Amino acid sequence: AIQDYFVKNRVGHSKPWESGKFKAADNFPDLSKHNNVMASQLTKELYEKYWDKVTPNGVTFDKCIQTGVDNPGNKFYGKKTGCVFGDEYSYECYKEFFDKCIEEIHHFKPSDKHPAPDLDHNKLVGGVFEDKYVKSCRIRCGRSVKGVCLPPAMSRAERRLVEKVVSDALGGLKGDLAGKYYPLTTMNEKDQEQLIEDHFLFEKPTGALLTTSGCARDWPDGRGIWHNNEKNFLVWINEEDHIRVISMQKGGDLKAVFSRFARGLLEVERLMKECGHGLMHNDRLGYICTCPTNMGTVVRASVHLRLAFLEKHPRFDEMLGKLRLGKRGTGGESSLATDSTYDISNWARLGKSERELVQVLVDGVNLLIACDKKLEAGQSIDDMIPK
Amino acid sequence: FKAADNFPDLSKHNNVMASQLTKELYEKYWDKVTPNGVTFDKCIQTGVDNPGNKFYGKKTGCVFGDEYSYECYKEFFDKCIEEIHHFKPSDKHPAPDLDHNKLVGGVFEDKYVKSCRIRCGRSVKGVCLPPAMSRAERRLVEKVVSDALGGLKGDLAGKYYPLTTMNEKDQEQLIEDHFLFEKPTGALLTTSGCARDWPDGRGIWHNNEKNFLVWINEEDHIRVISMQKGGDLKAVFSRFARGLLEVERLMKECGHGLMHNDRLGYICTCPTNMGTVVRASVHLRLAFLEKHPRFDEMLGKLRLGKRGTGGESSLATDSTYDISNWARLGKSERELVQVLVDGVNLLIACDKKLEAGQSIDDMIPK
Ligand SMILES: Nc1ncnc2c1ncn2[C@@H]1O[C@H](COP(=O)(O)OP(=O)(O)O)[C@@H](O)[C@H]1O
Ligand SMILES: Nc1ncnc2c1ncn2[C@@H]1O[C@H](COP(=O)(O)OP(=O)(O)O)[C@@H](O)[C@H]1O
Ligand SMILES: N=C(N)NCC(=O)O
Ligand SMILES: N=C(N)NCC(=O)O
Ligand SMILES: [Mg+2]
Ligand SMILES: [Mg+2]
């Protein structure tokens, strides 16, 4: 019984509901100056209904929305999500709040349901861009391990479980896919930094969401990178998410980056299976992760896209919004463009297939590049912007 | 999962918790929740997260979540205390001594000391401390403290300027003038939870002259501050004592109790701030000594803590250092200001020697 108490106090914070001198209203967050997806969808009503309810793992509602409280604004590009899931139970315990987020982000309604997997890279039209415009190509997705708490709340022991488990199965791969794990704890600074500068490694734990949600606890115990000799298939271990599987290469041959991601993902998902550990999956929303942007396919495919004329255009960002494309910096989400170059990728992840989402990138990329071209030639693109 | 599966990997770390945490003491406390729901992992997290320090000092690396934390994990917390304040489980904390008249010296040379400051933190009982407290409690503490503060009369009275309604430009000015606390980027502050919902329930109270001030809901519930330019510690102590008396009374009057233990004096977030929870500092100019191979060693012996011109999370600029009393537990207030003054006295002399092209080996404490 004692462990029950311990487990449900996992947070180690005072629970304002239990002893009764406070109403929910007395704890209601102040989101006056806030601009995220949680402060868009959170209603005093929802809070009153959700604050005193705790998942089997000790996760509380405030545990969830803490990063959106602590982060009203953004010094870079985009509007943040302002909330995380702490376990495999958080979406269900607070479904009426998370359904609304999922809608804003993915355009995926409470009545909606995730489609079957399509990883056929061969069904893909386009994907091979001129290297003048496209500097390199990257496809990544994320996965969680089943019955384990996610990063924001997972304890030390669970994280050491994950690293073992995953860095184990990753050694089952073979051929141009074989490779080696490199734990961050023994990695010296210069190597670490050179891997980040080169785009193969996750940043130092300085990101807002990373620190305020609690994915940077105990750093770097449990944090590591696995890659092949070519370093064109890499896996991250225990940063934002237990696993990120990453295909990438310089140039503009997306199609080849997808053909490999598809080849490596299927192995990894199978080997994980082959060791007895499943991956956190929901019937309605597919695959689950720390952030509600990372659901469904969890796929985000991007290019480094130099747009020297179109970026200066007034309706550039609008075009991105309608074309349903994120816009990040050269070095990532917490970075600004360089040399007029933007990381540009599919925004929605829930409610389309891997191939469908990669076709979106492709199709919108062409329009983005085709307009840069029109502009160069002292011309107009007013009609090539979606209505 | 046992306790041993979750024991922190402190291979690199350098701080008190890493220094005092045994596998044996982790197995015992790890599954022990306080009355308010605060855990042992909650308490030590800041130290696991923080193996090193970019600035001066070996850091603590652990905190109390609430008023029951010290008691719950006492076998581990008594070891951290002893390292810091040189205080034993058998010892007791003396009766307060706020009489600045018994003070010897405490009026240094304008050449050497640009300003003085005396502060202590206070904790409102009945509610959790900044690391574990809800928005509900923090709003509660803020209302209760700013009410009582209306009570101040004379030259001490001032206004309460809430942080949520203060604009970034006033805020930046108060910090650069050393009055207000720094933006929430400190490793202790963030990794210990003290910056959740920031700035909800945060603010600073201060008189007109801005020589007497109060911090509300940064690291500790309350912090009481006296400071001024020049080198008249004895005056700042004079003022400090008055106001802290008035403050405790008013709080006592509103039927609000501060977290106190008959042995360990007053109790706050960090085990560095117990007892008198007092830090008396001078901004010291040391152009000659600072280059000496035994400098830091002298401070250590003198029980002086070293900090930068901007506070804890800064280095010294302009050969000017934030020198202060290291301990707070085990000695009255008067005694610690005497330790501060006596050390600052020595430091100044030594500087003069080195400047006169002279040596200071016999000056270094034995
Ligand atoms: N198309 C691309 N080509 C090369 N590197 C990329 C591309 N897109 C992103 N990256 C790199 O991947 C790293 C991860 O950035 P982030 O936005 O945090 O990605 P993710 O969403 O996969 O976590 C960054 O350093 C970034 O430079
Ligand atoms: N002796 C002093 N004279 C003038 N300003 C001081 C003195 N000591 C500290 N300060 C200022 O007071 C502020 C307190 O910050 P810090 O030292 O981090 O916290 P604490 O007040 O708890 O020690 C800092 O801005 C610092 O510049
Ligand atoms: N989780 C992320 N890294 N990005 C999406 C967001 O911040 O809302
Ligand atoms: N309480 C503090 N702010 N500092 C003391 C320490 O972290 O050791
Ligand atoms: Mg990322
Ligand atoms: Mg401080």
SS3 labels along chain B: CCCCCCCCCCCCCCEHHHHHCCHHHHHHHCCCCCCCCCCHHHHHHHHHCCCCCCCCCCECCCCCCCCCHHHHCHHHHHHHHHHHHCCCCCCCCCCCCCCHHHCCCCCCCCCCEEEEEEEEEECECCCCCCCCCCHHHHHHHHHHHHHHHHHCCHHHCEEEEECCCCCHHHHHHHHHCCCCCCCCCCHHHHHCCCCCCCCCCCEEEEECCCCEEEEECCCCCEEEEEEEECCCHHHHHHHHHHHHHHHHHHHHHCCCCECEECCCEEECCCCCCEECCEEEEEEEECCCHHHCCCHHHHHHHHCEEEEECCECCCCCECCEEEEEECCCCCCCHHHHHHHHHHHHHHHHHHHHHHHCCCCCCCCCCC
What is the Cα–Cα distance from B143 to B137, expressed in whole angstroms? Answer: 10
- Torsions phi, psi of B59, nearest 5? -85, 160
Nearest to B289 by CA among B359, B200, B354: B354
A290 ligand 3 Cβ < 6 A: no
Quick one: A21-110 is in which CATH superfamily? ATP:guanido phosphotransferase, N-terminal domain (1.10.135.10)
Written as six digits, the tokens of B8 are 């922190």
Question: Each residue of B13-51: b (16+ CB within 10 Å) or e?
Answer: bebbbbebbeeebbeebbbebbebbbbbbbbbbbbbbbb
Length of chain B in residues, anyone? 366
DSSP A279: B
What is the Cα–Cα distance from B92 to B105, expressed in whole angstroms? Answer: 28
* Per-residue CA distances from B97 to B54, B285, B335 (Å): 35, 29, 8
Q: Find tokens 């404490």 and name the residue.
A: B365
Kind of pairing, strands A300-306 and B212-216?
Answer: unpaired
Point out which residues pair with B223 in neighbouring strands: B121, B215
Residues 6 or more apart whose CB falls under 8 angstroms from that of B316 comprise: B290, B308, B309, B322
User: B244 and B99 in contact (C-beta within 8 Å)?
Assistant: no
Q: Find tokens 């058998």 and name the residue.
A: B90
What is the Cα–Cα distance from B125 to B141, expressed in whole angstroms? Answer: 9
What is the Cα–Cα distance from A68 to A53, expressed in whole angstroms? Answer: 19
What is the Cα–Cα distance from A311 to A315, expressed in whole angstroms? Answer: 9
AA letter at A355: R
Nearest chain B residue to A6 by CA distance is B31
- Torsions phi, psi of B250, nearest 5? -50, -45
What is the Cα–Cα distance from B292 to A313, expressed in whole angstroms? Answer: 60
Domain with CATH 1.10.135.10 in chain B: 1-89
Q: Find tokens 């209760």 and name the residue.
A: B144
What is the Cα–Cα distance from A182 to A194, expressed in whole angstroms? Answer: 14
Nearest to A135 by CA among A1, A304, A344: A304
In Å, what resolution does this model reach? 2.3
Q: In this structure, how many other beta carbons lie within 10 angstroms of the beta carbon of residue A188? A: 7
Top CATH class of B1-89 equals mainly alpha
* Per-residue CA distances from A45 to A28, A89, A97, A128, B43 (Å): 10, 21, 10, 50, 33
A248 ligand 1 Cβ < 6 A: yes
Annotation says B82 is catalytic: no
Residue A60 labeled ligand binder: no
Residue B82 labeled ligand binder: no
Top CATH class of B92-366 equals alpha beta
Written as six digits, the tokens of A343 are 């990381």
Nearest to A61 by CA among A23, A106, A34, A98: A98
Q: Which of B142, B218, B219, B246 is catalytic?
A: B219
Torsion region of A324: left, alpha or beta (phi above 0 gives left; psi -120 to 50 gives alpha): left
* Per-residue CA distances from A100 to A40, A41, B32, B246 (Å): 9, 6, 38, 52
What is the Cα–Cα distance from A153 to A137, expressed in whole angstroms? Answer: 32
Distance A80 CA to ligand 3 centre (A): 6
* Strand, coil or helix: A227: strand
Written as six digits, the tokens of A236 are 């991250």
Domain A113-387: which topology? Answer: Creatine Kinase; Chain A, domain 2 (3.30.590)
| Experimental technique of record | X-ray
What is the Cα–Cα distance from B42 to B131, expressed in whole angstroms? Answer: 9
What is the Cα–Cα distance from A42 to A29, expressed in whole angstroms? Answer: 10
Query: What's the maximum distance between 2 C-alpha atoms anywhere in chain A?
Result: 74
Residues 6 or more apart whose CB falls under 8 angstroms from that of A189 comprise: none
DSSP A183: E
Residues 6 or more apart whose CB falls under 8 angstroms from that of A257 comprise: A137, A138, A139, A232, A247, A248, A249, A301
Kind of pairing, strands A341-346 and A224-228?
Answer: unpaired
Domain with CATH 1.10.135.10 in chain A: 21-110
What is the Cα–Cα distance from A25 to B166, expressed in whole angstroms? Answer: 24
* Strand, coil or helix: A324: coil
Domain with CATH 3.30.590.10 in chain B: 92-366
User: A71 and A291 in contact (C-beta within 8 Å)?
Assistant: no
Number of A/B CB contacts below 8 angstroms equals 94
Nearest to A16 by CA among B255, B127, B258, B142: B127
Written as six digits, the tokens of A303 are 């290019």
- Torsions phi, psi of A131, nearest 5? -75, -15
* Strand, coil or helix: A25: helix
* Strand, coil or helix: A362: helix
What is the Cα–Cα distance from B336 to B273, expressed in whole angstroms? Answer: 13
Q: In this structure, how many other beta carbons lie within 10 angstroms of the beta carbon of residue A312? A: 10
Q: Which of B270, B276, B303, B333 is catalytic?
A: B270
AA letter at A343: D
Question: Each residue of A269-300: b (16+ CB within 10 Å) or e?
Answer: bebbeeeebebbeeebbbbbbbbbbbbbbbbb
Residue nearest atom 1 in ligand 3 by C-alpha distance: A291
Nearest chain A residue to B43 by CA distance is A12
H-only helix segments in chain A: 2-8, 38-41, 44-50, 61-69, 90-93, 95-106, 156-169, 189-197, 208-213, 254-274, 316-322, 354-376
What is the Cα–Cα distance from B252 to B248, expressed in whole angstroms? Answer: 6
